[PDB]
């Protein structure tokens, strides 16, 4: 039945799956931090800072 | 860190039926929201205290980034805390060290408090606690308050 | 109670046809005696400019602001 | 004039990703009836 | 569980909230089990203002 | 066959057609179809159009280096004035493209077609036997288009003073118009602004109030058609906090207590508004400008005091001098 | 580069018009 | 359900679940902490804004001097 | 500024919960019907 | 020691205290007469 | 595992596709001018 | 709504007197401003 | 009577509804559905409805959420709903309904 | 019953106008803002903070008066009366533009009280609070343009002054410096507001012409005012007309009245995003391709380059006395002119 703006309302009545989702969001955030780090260490120039 | 988190997330999705999350007098899921906020406030407070007292101070950590007014010679150095009325100078590093110690102690105090007192009835019925959708309501307000003030700072 | 009935009730008339003119006249004298200009700090229309100056009074410091206005007003600007 | 090589990739992704998302939901709920 | 919204034949879900319950005055076991925690708290915050005085 | 005319009249006036094609519609499809085919070809690929008659052109086409926002169909040359300029009055195809021919084709067919749309509206509503007044509410955008595309050009003396058909072209027209006539201080433009903000506002109010009161709606459906009992359930109570605000403002201003004045008022507001500004644009076509104040405050020393009106006059002057390549000796002008 | 992208997006709007008129969902 | 060791250890930590101390409780005590916090926010807002000047504090970059 | 709209939407959905759904969580689901008919 | 702006803040919170004290005081009084 | 009891399906009917696709393709036409610069 | 007896202070009473008295003072101000010679 | 139902204060509704009285999991809560078949307020009037007031010698039970049914623009029925969330409120409603059904008629049923 | 409950019930009594808890913040703040503007357009000067005249006392008509912003030399000051710049002196406080901040902040609190009033009324009646949600569009607009934007510029001087001509000046200033019409978020806003007015007119007309019993000696009487309508017409008629003219129609009334709510509200939200972008002076002024082509080739003219020339003019001829605290003086051989091109 659910519209496209009610799909994550099936976690409301069980915490186990809610925590699965929350752990997942956290994985993505740490991954983005690391991946973005590595990427701009490939474009940073340390010879001249001034 | 992401790899480990992805695995634990998988673990918590396949195993979803754990009686901890149920309450067994009626066998249907519920949380104990005041107790949760208290536990996590205790953790938040102790981490804030540790971060201020060991990392920022340079007591065992490296300290923080300090500069001169014109930003010519800046470097990483220890910082002493400052609790006088010059600690609310928002261009004084010391105010930041003072804040994390102090805020941490408030966190410990309040965190213990919320384990050892239950809510009163008038608030529990007013703010409609026991409904996980109200915790979210409060958190969004806090989170956008924080974003606005860091945008300005 | 409809407003029409209390507006043409004798209790209204006996006090209010005495107080209404008093308010109108109090406003009229607040302007006509020159006082309106002295309370809200609005300049008189012969005096926006000093004799010496052809430049506008303009504020340039926030903590010595009232000082700068006090100075601008003595030179009749 | 200099037209970006990456302006084209933004355009391409901007349309193609949401369109295939909605289309997959639609065919999924059509096989829900039949 | 929640079966809702025949507007388009649709679904919407909402929380199941626990029942309210007026507390019972504490047993002496509950008092002494609580006493350990608050006493621990007292000395813990004392010790941290102590570390705070040292690091300045 | 039954001899094609009888079949043809049934075909045209049928209301079992998926899209009604009336007798207004019979004029409407060729005109609108010509207008749009010419428009898209011209927008993409019409070569630059000289617009001041000095042999310096402006590019509005997309294959000549524009994007969606900077492109336009550029108006007719200033040399032409208000002359009717069909393609057989030119002597070559390239010079008809160089003088801005197509723009006139588009707008003439567009106004014919958009009028026939109103006609087609009136006719269909007459066939179903309902109060035919959807058409008078549409007559407001239609009045507006006459005012902006046909009348202000005629009043000024040329179709070179028309609105370009493009995104940045409209912005250019608006800014230059404010520069020459001071539209903001024209009270009719103010009525126009009021009308469209108030329309948007009453749209949000009406929608919000109605969707809070509806409960469930269902009407019986068959395997070929619809039912005859439209079921509807709503809330039927309100409080005295929408009685000092809504009740004794609306019962007093609508001049009725009846609910049927709601939907009458909803459409009246923006329609009146857009008529008023549509009228105003035409009065400036004969150069009746809006209020402007210069030197409305002077002190008793004989020195001038400025006010906000004078700042707007400065900004207007700034725009207006930039618009004038033609000469630096211009004292008092237009048209 | 840019103009092909522009006309392609245009073309699929007008196609979507055609689809909305002659293939609407039968409401039952 | 899935009987498991860490779940049984954490079991007594989620076992009150809707219990409340009668009536108003410490609402009047909350209001005291609440008000103090608002007054604190005003003090540290006006110091930043240079509307409250407290001698010996200089709100500029030149305090890293 | 977007999290502002977020805040009001969720703040509404928790206080007006009893009207967004027809049922009240105060009531435990209904188990047995009584009538009243002439 | 006290600076003038600090007195000004003290003035400020004292007028704040007064005006809310009054508003709730008269509303509590007005409500509890005609209850 | 044992089936989740909170499993519900997800809907999207044709007219929502039409509307949604219109919005996607239209939004692309507005912002593509700025992406290409 | 508000009792017909109407004691001297009433929610209605203050509402119509905080929009009556300043306006009669202010219209008397503006009227006087009309006869000021520029 | 010694119990009656009004939708507007000061005048009585003179049409008698059918009532579903549902019991929650053993009685501390429940909810009552009234169905009114073409009441007098639905035929005539211009006074704003403000909930349903169940008035009797013991006071008032005031409830909102009164709905109407319109068919082709004709209002034909009113639905009203009251919810009981304390045993006090619940047994209170049963006593009011006993006084109402006794004074306006007629029987009462139950099904298990 | 305790004193809190007696007080609470008395605030929720049946009156001509509802007061409620939200009224307690609403009515003082709104009244004082409204009176503050009324006494400012009537007595208070602007002669020391802009060198302009904008008062009936100074002699001006309805359209050219304003309550005007403070100077640029005041920074981001709150301008309290007891603060260290007016130091408790009324005349200085009106002269320095302190009345501007009075209106802005009290009006923000009036708006907060009003959305809370909508919630409170909705909950005691028991309807959904959708009209409060609709009212977040004005608040978005207000807090983005009267509060967030000046807190990004340099002072409250570029905040929009309360007045008719004073806002007309804002429009030209935005048209000239930021080129606001070319920003996409404002494009989306114009479309939304005009679209709201469009749905308003069409709805209003097509409900009026499809009523049940437009003759027949209408035998329906209730009304039932809160319905607003939405059974006094046949939906089937309406659908069947529109589905032939435009080739599409609604078939569900609920979604129509939600679309009407959706359109003008989304419009204002997109524009609110746009102007919080301008606060950091992040604008789209130009397309880089057109500038490089125009630098390489000066036989290139478009309606967009033309806009750039006009904007270039607005700034230089308006600025020296729009921003007098910058003390620009521009010779008349350096001011832009079309005939120099
Ligand atoms: C703009 C309107 C708006 C609306 C509709 C909501 C709605 C709501 N909020 Mg929210 N809130 C808002 C703005 C708003 N909030 C803002 C801007 C903040 C600050 C970030 C908060 C922070 C907040 C929190 C954290 C919580 C709520 C809660 C609530 C809900 C509880 C009941 C209630 O009505 O409280 C409304 C009451 C208030 C908003 C209090 C107003 C306080 C004032 C008048 C302070 C004045 C201070 C001082 C005298 C003057 C300062 C001067 C200044 C220049 C320095 C609720 C309906 C709770 C909730 O989520 O409920 C589910 C909860 O956890 N509110
Ligand atoms: C609902 C009531 C209400 C609200 C919300 C406001 C809101 C506001 N008013 Mg205001 N005002 C009101 C009614 C109200 N007004 C009334 C009725 C009057 C007429 C008498 C005024 C007259 C007035 C003036 C003349 C001015 C304002 C100003 C202000 C604003 C600036 C912020 C400020 O100074 O906060 C003041 C608030 C505080 C300092 C917080 C007080 C907190 C309290 C009560 C707690 C104290 C506890 C304890 C004793 C503290 C111990 C501390 C210790 C431990 C150190 C703010 C917009 C000024 C303004 O807008 O400047 C731009 C301004 O000029 N007000
Ligand atoms: C397990 C510990 C851990 C540690 C030590 C770090 C360490 C680091 N992370 Mg990190 N991170 C972690 C886990 C960790 N990460 C996790 C789990 C996530 C995913 C959610 C991330 C996501 C993350 C991101 C996205 C980023 C980092 C970055 C960084 C690095 C730069 C410093 C910084 O950004 O600090 C700045 C930290 C702050 C400003 C924190 C402010 C905290 C707020 C405002 C809390 C207020 C709420 C509180 C409860 C209020 C009440 C308090 C109460 C006590 C009274 C630092 C090397 C950055 C980087 O360079 O990555 C390469 C970056 O962009 N982290
Ligand atoms: C002796 C101990 C001590 C000391 C020296 C400090 C020192 C500090 N604290 Mg503090 N604090 C302490 C104890 C202490 N704290 C304790 C015990 C608590 C409670 C646990 C707090 C709670 C606290 C809070 C809540 C905050 C601080 C912040 C800060 C610091 C920033 C100063 C600044 O930049 O202002 C910076 C900014 C302001 C003064 C503005 C505040 C704005 C307000 C309150 C309203 C926002 C309104 C609206 C949502 C915004 C719209 C914006 C839009 C118009 C653009 C400073 C380093 C602040 C911080 O981290 O800022 C970055 C902050 O917000 N502390
Ligand atoms: C902060 C956390 C938070 C959380 C946990 C929720 C949780 C929820 N919201 Mg809420 N919401 C939030 C923030 C949040 N929201 C914000 C900031 C707003 C303001 C815009 C809203 C406005 C909102 C509305 C208006 C509604 C919800 C609804 C919902 C529920 C529906 C399911 C869903 O996932 O949508 C399903 C997924 C989509 C709609 C797809 C979104 C595609 C987008 C636009 C983003 C793509 C990814 C993005 C670019 C990643 C970066 C994020 C950025 C913030 C950094 C869900 C329980 C709905 C509800 O209550 O259902 C009953 C409902 O009507 N939310
Ligand atoms: C021709 C078409 C057109 C249209 C349709 C729009 C549409 C819009 N423009 Mg505009 N604009 C245009 C052309 C157009 N623009 C041009 C050519 C320019 C030249 C540069 C501008 C420059 C411009 C600027 C500079 C700004 C806009 C803004 C806006 C938007 C905000 C909504 C609004 O009106 O807020 C109006 C104000 C409000 C909604 C606040 C209402 C506040 C309250 C409720 C006060 C209380 C009222 C009352 C006293 C209470 C009564 C009580 C009583 C009944 C009991 C809207 C999206 C604004 C915007 O997007 O901001 C986000 C903005 O800052 N526009
Ligand atoms: C400039 C255009 C504009 C104005 C003037 C305006 C006005 C208003 N909108 C309201 C509401 C709304 N507006 C809505 C949507 C919209 N509103 C829009 C545009 C506007 N809305 C748009 C475009 C939309 C579409 C999305 C909705 C959905 C609502 C409502 O629900 C609401 C309402 O109740 O409508 C009837 C009213 C709030 C009444 C109230 O109790 O105020 C409370 C505030 C008070 C009493 C005072 C506030 C503070 C003051 C005095 C400061 C401002 C400055 C002064 C007035 C000084 C003069 C300023 C000069 C420029 C003239 C008010 C008449
Ligand atoms: C080669 C070529 C030619 C290239 C193309 C060149 C070109 C110029 C391209 C333009 C691209 C461009 C710049 C686009 C920018 C605009 C853009 C992206 C806008 C959309 C994004 C946006 C603004 C979103 C937020 C605001 C928003 C939601 C606005 C909505 C606007 C909107 C659709 C308004 C409604 C219009 C409309 C006609 C509605 C009529 C509805 C209707 C038929 C109702 C009839 C009806 C009424 C009743 O009352 C009842 C009862 C029934 C039953 C019933 O049926
Ligand atoms: C000032 C402009 C020129 C004069 C007014 C023109 C009104 C045109 C309305 C067009 C709206 C779009 C069509 C949809 C709506 C539509 O179909 O309405 C139709 C309606 C007439 O139909 P009714 O069914 O109401 O009446 C049956 C008639 O046949 C016999 O009475 O029009 C009016 O009543 C117009 C007002 C005349 C009576 C009032 C006096 C005129 C001034 C007051 C109202 C108008 C101005 C102020 C409004 C805020
Ligand atoms: C398993 C494992 C592993 C691996 C893992 C990995 C490999 C990871 C990574 C991860 C990652 C690497 C991730 C990433 C992610 C990302 C993301 C998540 C992103 C997002 C984004 C966004 C969200 C955006 C947005 C936006 C846009 C797009 C535009 C505009 C702006 C914005 C911001 C809006 C290891 C071996 C180690 C260990 C063992 C196990
Ligand atoms: C500032 C201030 C304040 C305040 C004050 C106030 C609060 C005031 C008020 C005031 C007011 C409150 C005023 C009023 C005024 C009004 C008027 C002046 C009116 C007029 C009107 C008329 C004249 C009418 C007209 C019309 C209309 C409206 C519509 C239609 C048309 C006609 C013509 C009929 C305070 C003390 C707090 C503090 C310090 C400062
Ligand atoms: Cl030009
Ligand atoms: Mn011209």
Tab-separated table of C-alpha atoms in Angstrom, chain K:
chain	number	residue	atom	x	y	z
K	1	UNK	CA	15.570	-16.432	10.156
K	2	UNK	CA	11.791	-16.439	10.476
K	3	UNK	CA	9.695	-14.082	8.281
K	4	UNK	CA	9.352	-10.438	9.303
K	5	UNK	CA	5.729	-9.735	10.358
K	6	UNK	CA	6.059	-6.066	9.412
K	7	UNK	CA	6.509	-6.794	5.685
K	8	UNK	CA	4.282	-4.598	3.521
K	9	UNK	CA	4.414	-3.926	-0.242
K	10	UNK	CA	5.077	-0.682	-2.100
K	11	UNK	CA	2.799	0.938	-4.718
K	12	UNK	CA	3.211	3.369	-7.597
K	13	UNK	CA	0.454	3.762	-10.171
K	14	UNK	CA	0.695	4.934	-13.763
K	15	UNK	CA	-0.394	8.542	-13.322
K	16	UNK	CA	2.223	8.970	-10.616
K	17	UNK	CA	4.824	7.751	-13.134
K	18	UNK	CA	3.626	10.300	-15.666
K	19	UNK	CA	3.705	13.146	-13.129
K	20	UNK	CA	7.016	12.069	-11.647
K	21	UNK	CA	8.757	11.618	-14.987
K	22	UNK	CA	7.448	15.015	-16.101
K	23	UNK	CA	8.980	16.630	-13.037
K	24	UNK	CA	12.323	14.831	-13.505
K	25	UNK	CA	12.657	15.729	-17.211
K	26	UNK	CA	11.435	19.303	-16.676
K	27	UNK	CA	13.793	19.863	-13.754
K	28	UNK	CA	16.598	18.591	-15.962
K	29	UNK	CA	15.728	21.095	-18.676
K	30	UNK	CA	15.885	23.953	-16.164
K	31	UNK	CA	19.163	23.028	-14.467
K	32	UNK	CA	21.003	21.633	-17.506
K	33	UNK	CA	21.485	25.212	-18.727
K	34	UNK	CA	23.446	25.875	-15.558
K	35	UNK	CA	25.385	22.615	-15.490
K	36	UNK	CA	26.782	23.151	-18.979
K	37	UNK	CA	27.226	26.831	-18.030
